[PDB]
Enzyme design. Structure first.
Site, PDB file in Angstrom:
ATOM      1  N   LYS B 535       0.825  -1.174   0.000  1.00 56.78           N
ATOM      2  CA  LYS B 535       0.000   0.000   0.000  1.00 56.78           C
ATOM      3  C   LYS B 535       0.858   1.221   0.000  1.00 56.78           C
ATOM      4  O   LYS B 535       0.378   2.327   0.244  1.00 56.78           O
ATOM      5  CB  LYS B 535      -0.931   0.065   1.223  1.00 56.78           C
ATOM      6  CG  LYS B 535      -1.982   1.175   1.174  1.00 56.78           C
ATOM      7  CD  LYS B 535      -2.982   1.005   0.032  1.00 56.78           C
ATOM      8  CE  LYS B 535      -4.187   0.145   0.409  1.00 56.78           C
ATOM      9  NZ  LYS B 535      -4.995   0.832   1.439  1.00 56.78           N
ATOM     10  N   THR B 536       2.154   1.056  -0.308  1.00 54.44           N
ATOM     11  CA  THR B 536       2.994   2.195  -0.522  1.00 54.44           C
ATOM     12  C   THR B 536       2.649   2.764  -1.848  1.00 54.44           C
ATOM     13  O   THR B 536       2.868   3.943  -2.121  1.00 54.44           O
ATOM     14  CB  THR B 536       4.454   1.901  -0.525  1.00 54.44           C
ATOM     15  OG1 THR B 536       4.751   0.941  -1.521  1.00 54.44           O
ATOM     16  CG2 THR B 536       4.848   1.383   0.863  1.00 54.44           C
ATOM     17  N   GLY B 537       2.117   1.924  -2.743  1.00 55.08           N
ATOM     18  CA  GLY B 537       2.177   2.303  -4.115  1.00 55.08           C
ATOM     19  C   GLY B 537       3.059   1.295  -4.775  1.00 55.08           C
ATOM     20  O   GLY B 537       3.447   1.454  -5.931  1.00 55.08           O
ATOM     21  N   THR B 538       3.392   0.200  -4.056  1.00 55.69           N
ATOM     22  CA  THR B 538       4.052  -0.938  -4.721  1.00 55.69           C
ATOM     23  C   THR B 538       3.232  -1.574  -5.846  1.00 55.69           C
ATOM     24  O   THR B 538       3.785  -1.859  -6.900  1.00 55.69           O
ATOM     25  CB  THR B 538       4.408  -2.015  -3.692  1.00 55.69           C
ATOM     26  OG1 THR B 538       3.250  -2.485  -3.028  1.00 55.69           O
ATOM     27  CG2 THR B 538       5.350  -1.536  -2.601  1.00 55.69           C
ATOM     28  N   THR B 539       1.915  -1.748  -5.677  1.00 57.68           N
ATOM     29  CA  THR B 539       1.034  -2.257  -6.749  1.00 57.68           C
ATOM     30  C   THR B 539       0.937  -1.287  -7.929  1.00 57.68           C
ATOM     31  O   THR B 539       0.822  -1.736  -9.060  1.00 57.68           O
ATOM     32  CB  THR B 539      -0.389  -2.532  -6.237  1.00 57.68           C
ATOM     33  OG1 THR B 539      -0.380  -3.398  -5.121  1.00 57.68           O
ATOM     34  CG2 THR B 539      -1.301  -3.174  -7.281  1.00 57.68           C
ATOM     35  N   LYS B 754      -7.037   0.028  -2.390  1.00 57.59           N
ATOM     36  CA  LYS B 754      -6.306   1.222  -2.095  1.00 57.59           C
ATOM     37  C   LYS B 754      -6.798   2.289  -3.010  1.00 57.59           C
ATOM     38  O   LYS B 754      -7.519   2.014  -3.968  1.00 57.59           O
ATOM     39  CB  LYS B 754      -4.787   1.095  -2.319  1.00 57.59           C
ATOM     40  CG  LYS B 754      -4.391   0.841  -3.774  1.00 57.59           C
ATOM     41  CD  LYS B 754      -2.879   0.905  -4.013  1.00 57.59           C
ATOM     42  CE  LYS B 754      -2.393   0.033  -5.173  1.00 57.59           C
ATOM     43  NZ  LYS B 754      -2.715  -1.386  -4.903  1.00 57.59           N
ATOM     44  N   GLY B 755      -6.423   3.550  -2.726  1.00 62.89           N
ATOM     45  CA  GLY B 755      -6.756   4.617  -3.620  1.00 62.89           C
ATOM     46  C   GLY B 755      -8.099   5.144  -3.239  1.00 62.89           C
ATOM     47  O   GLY B 755      -8.620   6.057  -3.877  1.00 62.89           O
ATOM     48  N   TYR B 758     -10.553   8.839   1.720  1.00 63.69           N
ATOM     49  CA  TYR B 758     -11.193   8.879   3.000  1.00 63.69           C
ATOM     50  C   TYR B 758     -10.660  10.113   3.636  1.00 63.69           C
ATOM     51  O   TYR B 758      -9.600  10.607   3.247  1.00 63.69           O
ATOM     52  CB  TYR B 758     -10.897   7.674   3.939  1.00 63.69           C
ATOM     53  CG  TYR B 758      -9.525   7.183   3.694  1.00 63.69           C
ATOM     54  CD1 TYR B 758      -9.347   6.363   2.612  1.00 63.69           C
ATOM     55  CD2 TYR B 758      -8.478   7.519   4.534  1.00 63.69           C
ATOM     56  CE1 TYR B 758      -8.124   5.841   2.257  1.00 63.69           C
ATOM     57  CE2 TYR B 758      -7.265   7.004   4.179  1.00 63.69           C
ATOM     58  CZ  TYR B 758      -7.080   6.189   3.072  1.00 63.69           C
ATOM     59  OH  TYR B 758      -5.769   5.739   2.832  1.00 63.69           O
TER      60      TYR B 758
END
EC number: 3.5.1.-
Lengths: 806, 803
Positions: B535-539, B754-755, B758
């Site tokens: 959920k760093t932005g690894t995906t 993610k993304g 919220y």
């Protein structure tokens, strides 16, 4: 005997960023005292203090004094033993802690700390040995900023008070004992520990450095505990430049009354600082802007004139850098010189100033040439670099023999005429005077050239207010012997005190965006080669350089022919002539992209100077060295000199050259040194590894470069990040004549490495090979450790040699 | 106190004596640290928290111990006295060194460059406690070099005593020495009562074989048996090639009687000795009437003797793709075993000459379980041909693989005899040689011999009969025989590490790699591992890398999870080959640059070591964002999941909660907090890999301009051409994040998980997490600077404001 510990200061910071850590560092940097920062956990061990026979740091400083007192028993006993054995003193600062109780006994110390106090009315107690040098000073009346303060209490010879303050409340610290008098005693905010018992002398500061008097006492603490191995002189040199004479908007120019007040204030200052003179910076064109009251100001200035010192700007007062052509700058200077002679404003001074406070940066060679030609000015000055601040950060440099001095701001700036605009109101002027940037500039710089303006002058007479109040404040709180030097002798004195200033290193103008914008666009940091092939020479460095060049993206630089086949720009004239002369060599990089440029000098490795000088100007640069068995490299250099048929290489066999000791004549010893010193490969690579990042540095196996150059070229392209890799197995061929691999050309022609290097030689003698194997044994062992620690591969021959004992 | 760790000061690691010292420490398998003793150089800080780094200090060369600066010498001596760290020292004879000299600081005189002979153990010393007392080692000790020690003190007790070669005593005899030469001390113990530290000093270099034996006893004595190597030794003797061989191979009648008689003599030495008979059916009954009577006697053995099959087929699994053909050959050999009545129960077999052992074929392991159910097998080759000591057994597919040892006969060579190394090399491995050292150091030894071997010089019989006699004269160890399956279970009980399968590439074996087709490529294995934390932005990075056509992602197992979680999952246990099939096989002509993304790998301790063993080259990529925003994004992910714990409590209620939190609440707390760790996890990767190897991305920059992050990733991978991600990415306001731009301007966003936008985490939770991560963000800033990678923009901002 000299202290075992070096003049070096060990500074234990909570963190660098942290405000007190940055203030401690800023004082060390200004003083240009050498220091080492370490983050000190209380838990964290102290760095290995000693380096054999000597203590690393004569002085130790704890930003957080709790990190010094909270030590493990082993590291505490180790540090205390070091402090006693070497006589290293400790400076400590205390910060009040919310968590901490207000009142606590300091660890290891009988001393009591009372924390989170408002304080007021600070005074220097002459008693404490700390700042005798500072005169007993006036009481700093009013409120010391910060609730935070800690005061120290103890009774002993051990602890002498240096600074004494009152609590904000009229009442003394609450729950005072009977013994305490009804009237509160002055409480110690700074204490000196004689530290006889400990064996170490300490100075403890209750409050943050930020409080301005703590910065003054901190300079004295560093001087005292060091043993003043190096001390900052009492002596201070002040020059006040009044720029923009005969320049400014109407009213900026002094009227008759303002010119009289300028002369009268010069005479008041002179008492303070002797032979006070004013140095008047003039522009002709602007001149006689003034109306009848301003023209009467110009007349009074000239009636002054003989007394006053004078220097030119440009009539145009344009920045000289802009004017690329040196003749246009020299003509503007000659017009301003003609006006000075007509005036009678002294030519004699032989001073000139960069117009528009500019043209100094980026350093323009044409400006320095024109200044010698028209005005013969040894000395100039600039604010600009590296930036406006740190003031401390900038130091004077010498270029083309002209001594360049750092200019200081009052804090008045050209841009903002008005004080009011200046944020923070009247308190911000007081803050720069006490512990401010302008106060710190005089405290830390032995030499201060203050920039002011005539335009500023017609105004509040804020210039007169600022200097009259500054001199009075300095005289109340510190003892400095204020002097003025004629600018040329002052510059000679500056570069005598700073050696480094004498030999400058200059950044390319690109780095600072505003310097790069003054600078012509084309010149870029990028333009200098990213990659430096440092040697050692007779690495087969020319072969690697030639094979690298081939990759189309990768472009080699145009060597100075004169200096040598090797570019040798750093050592050679090219540096001396300047960086700009070298860049001019370089064509403006392709529009679409700039090529990945590289150079190869033997000289870089050999010279100590070249590694540090290259890393300062392009830290960016990749650094590449090539290691082959140091005996075969020494023999290849001897056979190179014979090819040269220089008289020494013809006279002496390689064995006679290396064997020869002190007896050998200077030419034989120079050949011995070129054979052996470069042998040293681990010793020379360690200097590059101390400057350049491990990724930044690549250590090639020179045995592998000789036997398959294409494998070595693949490693080099990966290390550079060259856009494209090359299959050097397709572009290289073994030339039986050479006995070495060469670039394959179409037609199957070979482009060999330079003949002179690797010139055909007789077989090396077995006795010379055995002698050099034993001579290099300990050097090859240390090379193997260093390459392993790098993670860089050891040379294939070095791994083979170190596996078999034989 | 002091750690078990040994500090070894070598002249150089590389040098021959440095490697011999290290090889003894490794065989002992006691933890150690090697340092090159600087004469000048300071010692590394010995102590940590009050404990000594090393309980024991060893100086290969005693001159490295004596040459110190006064400060570092006084520091080291104070450490030795305060912790009781013992010192072992060796002398090296030196031309330079005087023949007679006083050691510095101690009374003990050194007399150097002596021939010596007839060495004895002083009666005080056992010397080996276990061993029965040793006879005088008669004859010539090799080497001029030797040093003998002389001193008068309580402090110095002689351990080994030898004579000079010359009848006459060593010149410059001391007063103490009589006219007749005294037996000179070649090893001395310093009680070090006075010194405060005990020492043991060895006159001569390690290389001489008796010094290696006395060195093992010195480590055992000085330790206090804090660390010890077991008395107990397990021996199995496999007789391969039963009923196998050319005519004449089959054993003669008198050789078979001598085999039986010697088995009964050995039994006396060690009880319940068994010989384990490896047979090939097909070959069997090669022999003529005298060899067939040999086959009959072998079967009369049968009940007593242990038995195992070698394949009738002797096929290698590589050769036939089909597993059914291998299983049928195994079933025929099993039927023959039952008809003999050769016991099923052992259920043990080994591949003939370890044939077809490798490259590991999954079909071989399946067929072996199916037909023979063999828990256990053995192989010489592995893990590495040498050192033998290096070799450790491994577990794969539930089968326990044991290291086989040579007597020195080599299967690989057709004849050992024929090929040089000679008869003296067999004698040398037996006397103090490699075969003796194998039994000395390896707690379990499976010796390979041949029936064919017997028909011969009977060099096999000579070698083992002489080895056992020599071991019994000079050492005592409790010899045992363990049936191979229980022995393997015992092995992987004593070391977990062996039990945990070691995953190695085929690459190491050039011939195994050549058997494998070209098609298998490095590229096929993911060159790049995106390790997280998640959920760093690894995906997002993984998707955009895959997007570049050159770059291909792996196909996540549907079942396993969205993420491959190869390493974590069982499948990793399943095997490397299953994973290589999984990603698409690169074209023969060209192989794609493959990559995978698992959150786990970064976080997991297991993942760093597991990835570095298989890659090892492979690029490692991590993404760091403010650890508070990453914790909050994980909490909001679990709520999206509507996992009951993440829905029930808010992030502040989850972290505050202590043991009160249930296992699910603690698992959510750990997933919020642990990955926050970024400096701690990156330090483990930085301890293993080159800066080039590892890339640390600013995850704030990947979220705010993904195209800047993608340019850094392409440069770090060495992709030939970079692609401008500012043209192929777009910010999706709905997402609140950057997404892939598709034609039509449509966005392919990150998944639901993610993304999600919220509302920001609450100010009190943000302040709490800022203070919680402060020291972690400080260490991250140091680590990234040391990497030379820039600190994240968010990390610089966080570290500047103390408050």
């Amino acid at each position: 005997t000299p202290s075992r510990t070096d003049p070096l200061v060990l500074v234990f910071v909570e963190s660098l960023y942290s405000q007190l850590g940055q203030e401690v560092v800023a004082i060390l940097e200004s003083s240009r005292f050498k220091y080492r920062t370490e983050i000190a956990p209380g838990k964290g061990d102290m760095p290995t203090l000693t380096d054999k026979g000597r203590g690393r740091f004569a002085l130790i400083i704890y930003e957080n004094i709790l990190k010094y007192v909270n030590l493990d028993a082993w590291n505490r006993e180790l540090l205390d033993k070091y402090c006693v054995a070497y006589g290293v003193g400790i400076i400590g600062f205390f910060k009040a802690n919310e968590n901490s109780l207000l009142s606590a006994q300091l660890k290891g110390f009988p001393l009591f700390l009372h924390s989170n106090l408002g304080l007021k009315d600070c005074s220097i107690n002459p008693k404490s040995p700390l700042l005798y040098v500072t005169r007993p000073s006036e009481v700093e009346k009013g409120v010391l900023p910060g609730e935070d303060w800690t005061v120290f209490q103890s009774n002993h010879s051990t602890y002498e008070p240096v600074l004494l303050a009152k609590t904000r409340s009229s009442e003394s610290i609450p729950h005072l004992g009977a013994d305490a008098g009804l009237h509160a005693a002055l409480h110690a905010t700074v204490v000196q520990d004689l530290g006889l018992h400990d064996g170490i002398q300490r100075v403890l500061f209750g409050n943050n450095l930020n409080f301005w008097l703590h910065k003054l006492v901190f300079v004295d603490a560093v001087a005292f505990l060091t043993g003043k191995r190096l001390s900052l002189p009492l002596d201070r040199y002040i020059l006040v430049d009044i720029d923009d004479i005969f320049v400014g908007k109407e009213g900026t120019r002094m009227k008759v009354e303002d010119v009289k007040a300028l002369f009268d204030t010069q005479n008041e200052l002179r008492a303070h600082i002797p032979n006070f003179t004013f140095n008047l910076g003039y522009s002709g064109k602007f001149f006689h802007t003034g109306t009848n009251a301003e023209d009467a100001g110009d007349d009074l200035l000239l009636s002054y004139v003989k007394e006053f010192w004078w220097f030119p700007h440009m009539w145009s007062h344009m920045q000289p850098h802009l004017f690329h052509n040196q003749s246009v700058l020299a003509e503007q200077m000659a017009l301003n010189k003609k006006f000075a002679v007509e005036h009678g404003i002294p030519t004699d001074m032989g001073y000139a100033v960069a117009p528009h406070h500019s043209g100094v940066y980026p350093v323009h060679v044409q400006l320095y040439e024109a200044w010698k030609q028209v005005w013969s000015i040894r000395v100039t000055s600039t604010e600009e670099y590296p930036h406006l601040k740190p003031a401390r950060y900038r130091r004077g440099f010498i270029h083309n023999g002209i001594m360049v001095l750092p200019r200081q701001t009052c804090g008045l700036f050209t841009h903002t005429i008005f004080y009011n605009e200046y944020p923070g109101g009247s308190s911000e002027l007081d803050k720069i005077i006490n512990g401010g940037e302008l106060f710190l500039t005089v405290l830390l710089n032995p030499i201060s050239i203050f920039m002011t303006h005539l335009s500023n002058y017609g105004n509040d007479r804020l210039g007169l207010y600022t200097f009259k109040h500054l001199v009075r404040f300095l005289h109340s709180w510190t003892n400095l012997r204020l002097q003025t030097l004629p600018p040329v002798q002052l510059a000679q004195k500056y570069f005598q005190i700073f050696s480094e200033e004498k030999d400058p290193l200059w950044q390319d103008p690109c780095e600072d965006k505003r310097h790069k914008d003054i600078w012509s666009k084309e010149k870029t940091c990028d333009r200098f080669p990213k990659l430096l092939i440092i040697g050692p020479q007779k690495t087969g460095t020319t072969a690697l350089y030639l094979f690298l060049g081939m990759h189309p993206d990768l472009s080699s630089n145009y060597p100075s022919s004169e200096t040598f086949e090797e570019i040798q720009f750093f050592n050679g004239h090219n540096y001396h002539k300047g960086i700009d002369w070298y860049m001019e060599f370089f064509p403006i990089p392709s529009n679409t992209t700039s090529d990945f440029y590289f150079e190869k000098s033997a000289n870089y490795f050999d010279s100590e100077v070249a590694p540090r000088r290259a890393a300062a100007l392009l830290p960016k640069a990749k650094v590449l060295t090539i290691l082959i068995n140091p005996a075969d490299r020494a023999y290849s250099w001897y056979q190179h000199q014979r090819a040269h048929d220089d008289p020494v290489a013809l006279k002496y066999t390689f064995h006679e050259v290396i064997t020869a000791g002190s007896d050998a004549s200077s030419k034989l010893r120079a050949l011995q040194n070129r054979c052996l010193v470069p042998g040293w490969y681990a010793t020379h690579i360690e200097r590059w590894l101390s400057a350049y990042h491990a990724n930044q540095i690549l250590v090639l196996d020179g045995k592998l470069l000789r036997t398959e150059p294409a494998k070595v070229m693949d490693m080099v392209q990966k290390f550079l990040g060259v856009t494209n890799t090359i299959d050097y197995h397709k572009t290289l061929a073994f030339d039986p004549k050479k006995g070495f691999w060469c670039q394959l050309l179409e037609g199957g022609k070979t482009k060999c490495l330079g003949k002179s290097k690797g010139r055909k030689y007789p077989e090396m003698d077995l006795d010379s090979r055995a002698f050099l194997k034993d001579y290099y044994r300990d050097h090859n062992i240390e090379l193997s450790k260093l390459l392993y620690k790098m993670g860089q591969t050891l040379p294939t021959w070095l791994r083979e040699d170190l596996q078999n004992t034989r």
